[PDB]
Write a protein that binds this ligand. Structure first.
Ligand SMILES: CC(=O)N[C@@H]1[C@@H](O[C@@H]2O[C@@H](C)[C@@H](O)[C@@H](O)[C@@H]2O)[C@H](O[C@@H]2O[C@H](CO)[C@H](O)[C@H](O)[C@H]2O[C@@H]2O[C@@H](C)[C@@H](O)[C@@H](O)[C@@H]2O)[C@@H](CO)O[C@@H]1O
Ligand SMILES: CC(=O)N[C@@H]1[C@@H](O[C@@H]2O[C@@H](C)[C@@H](O)[C@@H](O)[C@@H]2O)[C@H](O[C@@H]2O[C@H](CO)[C@H](O)[C@H](O)[C@H]2O[C@@H]2O[C@@H](C)[C@@H](O)[C@@H](O)[C@@H]2O)[C@@H](CO)O[C@@H]1O
Lengths: 449, 449
């Protein structure tokens, strides 16, 4: 047996890493006020998306490869998009659905139909609530917690009653009240109702912020941190790269809007395909999920251009992965045992993996059997045994000279590394630094479309 | 009052950093044999450029903003491109210029005319020389040394007899003799003849390899290293990022070819303008020089496409820097003294700088006086006092919300950081990690053409 190394991921964490793509939905009063942050003074009468079709949101996301939908149900403005018992500042007083509307239910029904996992974003900062004050913070915490209970205990919310992620945004305006949150009590309730449901927060939960809203994970990206170096004043580079000596497994989730803003603005356009592809390689291609925000318009529909762009992005990915040019390639180099043999890297069996306790550097050489043309290499670690690799490089033989293809720090769950398009038959993967004996589950090669 | 921090750059190091752009020329038997490496078996009869014109090489490089030209005078194949006294394997037995050719002379004459600084590449690995053998190590070292003297002592070579850089490539083929080099003796002779002349080597000299041939400097890029971690087995990431605790100032030179290969190949084309721009931002824009290789063809001329590409590249840079949108902006934040005032960051005077010993984070806010449109910020440290900054980020105010523009690790001699195109009047530069109290000499803003 190989012993584990470092902090190990939970099954829910591994599941998210495997899923890769999640969608965010920011929609609410801000959409009608053409703004990014609201004050809590917005008029509920303005909230009337009469053409809203939550099933279309879910259908398009499902068809374009998203595996989770994180819905904003209360942004910083404090307007609640389901009929909570706990405030009057909700859809109950809006004309939408004649006051009888429940956006969390509408989305949940569609998600259940499509087997789309659900997340829920409930803003800690609340610019509306009279309880949002240091002098009333116990009451505000009870309000927040009561809403968690309403959302997470109702079998009609979630994907068949299940939530996969809870989002606790760390943002608060200059000159807001400095309310402190009862995080542990909140986390306890989340477990009680939803088990190992992932939580995004400023604290030492299973998901952290990557430290930017550009969709950019660092290299290295260690999916681990020490919770005592988080909080609202966590260093951006600490979030972006993680901690080589981290004590908990932590996914640095890469959130980014398809538009400049999180909410829909008529005068904005979605990112180009080119732009989304760069994001993809720097998020999913660095071993962390991409959480891409798609904001419905004032009608309650995704914008036509955004929809087109999501199908274009899905096509791109489907084409990228159409053929693994490394499948069945002969692999040589050191290997711990037959059970961890080199051939496990290209055998297309996800139940087989390679490992070596040899001295570094470790050099794996692939022979594709004939010259093939590629510009992407994919490597994967076995994170059930912990993240280990800290430096590697790749070379390709060109006219009898071993030339560089590219280099990196970490591998993680999955690392895509691009290089110049090359026609080659022999490739070397060289592991040069690792915290423990390296394991890899797969080496793949692709040509970008 | 301010004490220096860390290893300080030499005058020659600072001059190169200020110059930013160097050209490389790989030309020789390999050009005629359509290969990247040679064996020393190449036939000197075949070395016969129809129309070589070094003045044209120099003219174009000068007009396109290059400040130094590093010329290969002997590649791994061992063929010497000046009439050396120390081997018969040279242009003396070539039909070029009826056996009387001297490529170093032709280049130096033109370089002297155009005041183009000169570098020389003399390959340590020599596949031809009968002295290149462990049994004949001292004889090979004496051969290499004698050639350094031929090159570096002759007033007709260099820019008016001066060389700015000597290049000692670390590459050697796997099969080759394991000759060791008399580095210290070589460096002493280089100092005797050429003073502070920069040296690129695998050892602890003034220039190191960045660790790839893609034109990519890391972030961070510490322009310093510990010589005990260099040699041929230096880790690539160590070269690419430098050493936060480095003991010598070291420029990680970013060398890259305009083509896939270093030598000219008929079937290859130059990089796009877009590709060169990306390289630029990741080399010069991360505080290190770009050394761009332009290989003459079999006629001894630069390819017409390569030339056009060099002009397009120069045009781009000229446009980019045409207007500094931050000039004269009001700058607020902590400052060490009147001598180090905030206003020095945008006063246009290269002799005024800012510093602060305030507790981190240090926040500098610029007010441009009116909304301006930009997508690049430039920061510079004062490396005469040592490299210090280890983390910073930049924010811009958009509709009363402070939004991120971008973040990084190091600044160094010069850091360009691109962000989404924004129209803003107010920007914040926030320094969050620094090895000693931070200094900056300038903040500039540009719009990419
Ligand atoms: C309008 C806008 O761009 N605001 C950002 C703010 O984004 C927040 O998160 C996004 C997803 C969206 O819901 C926004 O409306 C919301 O304000 C950024 O806040 C960070 O957001 C990330 C998620 O991307 C985390 O939630 C993180 O904890 C937030 O940073 C915290 O709060 C900031 C105000 C700072 O105090 C920061 O140091 C904290 O960690 C902030 C990022 O600076 O930038 C705009 O405010
Ligand atoms: C054909 C080719 O691409 N060769 C590279 C080789 O490039 C060398 O340098 C360039 C500029 C050109 O003159 C090539 O003909 C020449 O072989 C690379 O060698 C590294 O080169 C850099 C400069 O870019 C430094 O000179 C560095 O010291 C070299 O690496 C050393 O030698 C290698 C063979 C490895 O042992 C390496 O770890 C050493 O540092 C190498 C890079 O691996 O790749 C091709 O051979």
């Amino acid at each position: 047996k190989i012993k584990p190394h470092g902090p190990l991921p939970s099954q829910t964490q591994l599941a998210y890493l495997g899923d890769e793509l999640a969608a965010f939905i920011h929609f609410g009063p801000n959409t009608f006020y053409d703004q990014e942050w609201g004050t809590g003074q917005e008029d509920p009468e303005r909230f009337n998306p009469s053409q809203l079709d939550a099933r279309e949101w879910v259908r398009v996301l499902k068809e374009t490869g998203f595996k989770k939908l994180i819905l904003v149900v209360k942004h910083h403005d404090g307007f609640v998009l389901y009929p909570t018992a706990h405030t009057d500042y909700s859809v109950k007083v809006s004309p939408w659905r004649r006051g009888k509307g429940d956006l969390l239910l509408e989305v949940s029904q569609a998600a259940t139909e499509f087997d789309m996992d659900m997340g829920v974003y409930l803003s800690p900062w609340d610019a509306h609530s009279p309880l949002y004050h240091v002098d009333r913070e116990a009451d505000y915490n009870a309000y927040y917690l009561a809403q968690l209970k309403e959302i997470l205990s109702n079998p009609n919310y979630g994907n068949a009653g299940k939530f996969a992620e809870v989002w606790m945004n760390g943002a608060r305006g200059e000159g807001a009240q400095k309310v402190n949150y009862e995080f542990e009590k909140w986390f306890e309730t989340i477990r009680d109702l939803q088990g190992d449901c992932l939580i995004f927060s400023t604290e030492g939960t299973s998901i952290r912020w990557i430290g930017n809203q550009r969709g950019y994970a660092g290299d290295p990206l260690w999916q681990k941190v020490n919770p005592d170096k988080l909080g609202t004043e966590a260093e951006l580079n600490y979030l972006q790269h993680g901690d080589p000596s981290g004590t908990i497994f932590s996914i640095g989730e890469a959130d980014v809007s398809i538009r400049p803003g999180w909410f829909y603005h008529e005068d904005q356009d979605p990112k180009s395909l080119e732009e989304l592809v760069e994001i993809y390689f720097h998020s999913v291609g660095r071993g962390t999920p991409l959480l891409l925000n798609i904001p419905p318009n004032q009608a309650g529909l995704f914008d036509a251009k955004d929809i087109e762009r999501l199908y274009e992005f899905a096509t791109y990915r489907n084409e990228l992965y159409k053929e693994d040019l490394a499948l069945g390639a002969e692999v040589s180099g050191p290997a711990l045992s037959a059970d961890f043999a080199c051939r496990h890297l290209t055998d297309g069996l996800e139940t087989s993996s390679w490992a070596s306790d040899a001295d570094l550097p470790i050099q794996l050489e692939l022979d594709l059997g004939s010259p093939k043309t590629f510009d992407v290499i994919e490597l994967r670690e076995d994170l059930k045994l912990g993240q280990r690799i800290a430096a590697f490089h790749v070379q390709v033989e060109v006219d009898g000279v071993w030339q560089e293809f590219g280099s990196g720090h970490t591998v993680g769950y999955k690392r895509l590394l691009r290089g110049a398009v090359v026609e080659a038959q022999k490739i070397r993967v060289v592991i040069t630094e690792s915290q423990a004996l390296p394991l890899l589950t797969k080496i793949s090669l692709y040509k970008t479309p």
